[PDB]
Amino acid sequence: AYENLMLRPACPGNLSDTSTYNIDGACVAQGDIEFGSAVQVVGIVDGVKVVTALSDGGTPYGIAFRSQYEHLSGKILDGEVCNVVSHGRVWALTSLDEAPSLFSKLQFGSGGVVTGGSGYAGWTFAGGFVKHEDGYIIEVRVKQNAFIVPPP
Amino acid sequence: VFRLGNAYLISIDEIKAGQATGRPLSTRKASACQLAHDQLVNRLVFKGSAPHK
Amino acid sequence: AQINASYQRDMAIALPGMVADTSKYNIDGACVVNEGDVLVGAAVQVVQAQAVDGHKLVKALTTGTTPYGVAIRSHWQTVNAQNQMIYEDGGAINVMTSGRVWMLSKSTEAPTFGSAVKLDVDGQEKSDGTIETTWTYAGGWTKYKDIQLVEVQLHQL
Amino acid sequence: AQINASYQRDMAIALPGMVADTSKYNIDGACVVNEGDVLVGAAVQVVQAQAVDGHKLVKALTTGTTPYGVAIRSHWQTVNAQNQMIYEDGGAINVMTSGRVWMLSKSTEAPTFGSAVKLDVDGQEKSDGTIETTWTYAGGWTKYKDIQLVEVQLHQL
């Protein structure tokens, strides 16, 4: 990336390939959510889902999507409708420096940022690793019905 | 001879906003496709693709 | 004189065996009801898949069997029986193997958003069921008059 | 005087590496044959997926490797050789990572409907093969002349 290239490779929170994607449009935000980073489903009120940034003890649901009409501030603010990529292939945010093994199940922590691989169940790492600002961007192959919330 | 290909996504609200505020967004995403094709052509001349021979 | 009055009534949310949303979905319409009748809002089983012709012989769920899909609502193919819509022996059936549907339920409590769907021997959702499935819940939980309904999420199996 | 005659003949059902159904399928381009030739009805392995560019290098299955997808039959990209249709080295391959396709099989008995698919070291289906896949059978089981063909259901890796 960076110099010696006419175009920057990719930007976080955007789809990479046009292959069987699904975007939910009936969602509401509880706190400030940044593009990329997994989200939870706190509850459902009259059909819509109230999504929050990932926290401890919560199963991720999807990755936030970038729209240039809904959000005119560079991030999703409180009390704003948002799009969530429930299924597809999207660029996410990571706190890594080296690309993991191919088709390895990623792990999420902190505010929905990827901390490492070598998981047991969940989404997988596609082929992609680019540099962004001060850090890297990872490509995540989101699949629906991947994380099952544990029984109490 | 070979083939190249890109794609881009847009919504209805974005189209209407672009046509109403005077600054379109469709053209700005269509130009990126031509620039990407030109970059790919550039990369295949000064460098090569060993798997593609 | 008199004071005029105006009222309001809200329609229901869904009916059994009805596709809930317009998300990614897939119905297999090359199946035959081998034996018996199949309710609209219930799961099915695959008795046998033909090798040359390609039709699948579906049936109703029984004890100790893996569910395959959920029948859906169609005003043309289905035949009314027992004051409800039903699929008869013979003919073709619409079984969806992926998507969101409103299944019939036998439970009395609202389940969590995720979790795993469990069914009884009949094929209707039950909280303390015996047949484990990989399907998950979607969130919807309503009731049409005196019929309970629940929304589930399916995937190819 | 004389008695007239009328005859009949039926077409075949499948061809190696041909899409079987119109269900949800995902064919991935931007793959290259790193080395050797790849048959139309055989599984492939991913040697390397480039990070910045995006091309995935595709080879033929060997011992102790994870299968990725099945080659797809096309009249333009493929090159006719060995009285057959193959993908030559240094050319784009249409890999199906999801859907139903007609594979090449080395087995002799019809398989069950829902069960794991086992390949051999060559990349062709075998009832007692060593390499393990996550794909499942679909039911179809036919033969084109002297070639055996089997249908499988592919799941995204």
Spatial distance between the Cα atoms of C82 and C143, rounded to a whole number of angstroms = 20
Which subunits count as partners of chain A given 3+ CB pairs below 8 Å? B, C, D
DSSP letters, A67-116, are -TTT-SSSSBPTT-B--EEEEEEEEEEB--SS---TTPBPEEETTTEEEE
Which pairing describes strands A27-29 and A22-24: parallel, antiparallel, or unpaired?
unpaired
CA distance C125 to C103: 7
Q: Which residues of D touch A130 (CB under 8 A)?
A: 51-52
Task: Provide CB contacts within 8 A for D81, sequence distance 6+.
Answer: D37, D88
From C139's Cα to the closest Cα of chain A, the distance in A is 7
Contacts of B33 (CB under 8 A, 6+ apart): B6, B8
Amino acid in the structure at residue A89: R
Task: Find residue B13's DSSP bridge partners.
Answer: none
- Tell me if there are at least 3 CB pairs under 8 Å linking chains A and B: yes
The one-letter amino acid at C155 = H
Between CA D112 and CA D137 the distance in angstroms is: 7
Each residue of C22-56: b (16+ CB within 10 Å) or e? ebbbebbeebbbbeeebbbbbbbbbeebeeeebeb
> Any chain C CB within 8 A of the CB of A41?
yes
Yes or no, beta carbons of B53 and D57 under 8 Å apart = no
Distance of CA B41 to the CA centre of its chain: 13
Residues in chain B: 53
Neighbouring C-beta atoms of residue C122, cutoff 10 Å: 17
Q: How far apart, in whole angstroms, are the C-alpha atoms of residue A110 and residue C37?
A: 52
Residues of chain C with C-beta less than 8 angstroms from the C-beta of A49: 139
Half-sphere CA count of C32, side-chain side, radius 13 A:
12
Contact between residue D38 and residue D71 where contact means Cβ atoms under 8 Å apart: yes
D110 touches chain A (CB under 8 A): no
Q: Contact at 8 Å (CB) between A139 and A19?
A: no
Asked if residue A54 lies in contact with residue A92, where contact means CB atoms within 8 angstroms, the answer is no
Task: Please enumerate in sequence order all residues whose Cβ is within 8 A of that of B34, keeping only pairs 6 or more positions apart, or say none.
Answer: none
Separation CA C131–CA C119 (nearest Å)? 5
SS3 category, B14: helix
Structure tokens that stand for B4 in this block: 């190249």
d(CA D21, CA C56): 14
Structure obtained using: cryo-EM
Reference A40, options A124, A112, A105; nearest CA is A112
Reduce the secondary structure of D64-102 to three states and give it as a string: CCCCCCEECCCCCCCEEECCEEEECCCCECCEEEEEEEE
- Is some CB atom of chain A closer than 8 A to the CB atom of C114? yes
Q: Within an 8 Å CB–CB cutoff, is residue D12 touching chain C?
A: no
Q: How many CB atoms lie within 10 A of CB A19?
A: 15
Q: Which residues are bridge partners to A62 per DSSP?
A: A39
Tokens 């027992």 belong to residue: C82
Question: Is C53 an 8 Å CB contact of chain D?
Answer: no
Find, in chain B, the residue whose alpha carbon is nearest to that of A6. Answer: B39
C/A touch flag: 3 or more CB pairs below 8 Å:
yes
For residue A103, the one-letter residue type is F
Q: Do A124 and D49 touch (CB under 8 A)?
A: no
In this complex, how many residue pairs, one in chain C and one in chain D, have their CB atoms less than 8 Å apart? 28
- The span from the CA of D101 to the CA of D25, in Å, is 10
